[PDB]
Amino acid sequence: PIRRGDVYLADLSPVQGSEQGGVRPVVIIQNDTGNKYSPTVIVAAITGRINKAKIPTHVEIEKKKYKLDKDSVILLEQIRTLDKKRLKEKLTYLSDDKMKEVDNALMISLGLN
Template sequence: MEINRGDVFYVNRSETIGSEQRSGRPAIIVSNPECNEHSPVVEVVYLTCQYKKPMPTHVRIESIGRRSTALCEQITSVDVSRLGDYKGHLTEKEMEQVDVALMQSLGIHPLTQQAKVEPVGPSVDDAALAMIALRFLEGFLQKRCGVEISGSICSGLLGQKQR
């Protein structure tokens, strides 16, 4: 069975405790496509047709034929064997709203322009050690092996200008 993010399936019943949403209701697949393809479980957000107070983690869903609310504060892992009838697929706008509600529920904030991840590169210490090693090698080749080097290895490899 092909399972895509944003699909809505009926999830067959299982036992619940306390305020957990009882299965035996439709749920949105929210796990990523790679996991959906290879894992025996998927992450879902249950839908309810009952009125729920407005919350940042509640999303109105209308694309599956019945007005529902996605309860994004209750993310649940479900064995794929419990997935029943396919009910439909969310619109792109609905899925974007679900994503925002999931981030709100999990306390994940989108990165701003200022919050960029710096690429990992050699530290100043690594560059200094490399320079020392290259200068040593250059001197060794000239003195011990009689090899004349046109230009400087250090300058050529590290992109520095000759003095």
């Protein structure tokens, strides 16, 4: 039942250097065929806002959700493939409008167009 745009709690550790660690919310960015059948998902890390700045690859989460600060930011430059066993609990999902901004930052992040 995992779908693109869902938000899950995931354990991202261990990490190294500037990679995003901890157990934190992540947004599922993989296509839904993959989410249905594959052992793995691709996700983008979400973090609380530290020093609000205008960064092309970041997307602000606006509405406060379950286990999600209102100040939260999706980091489209912190991306990874996780075994699904890493997903802990479904927190929420993002609106179609928000997922458009996510797609746009993802395309910036990955040098697509």
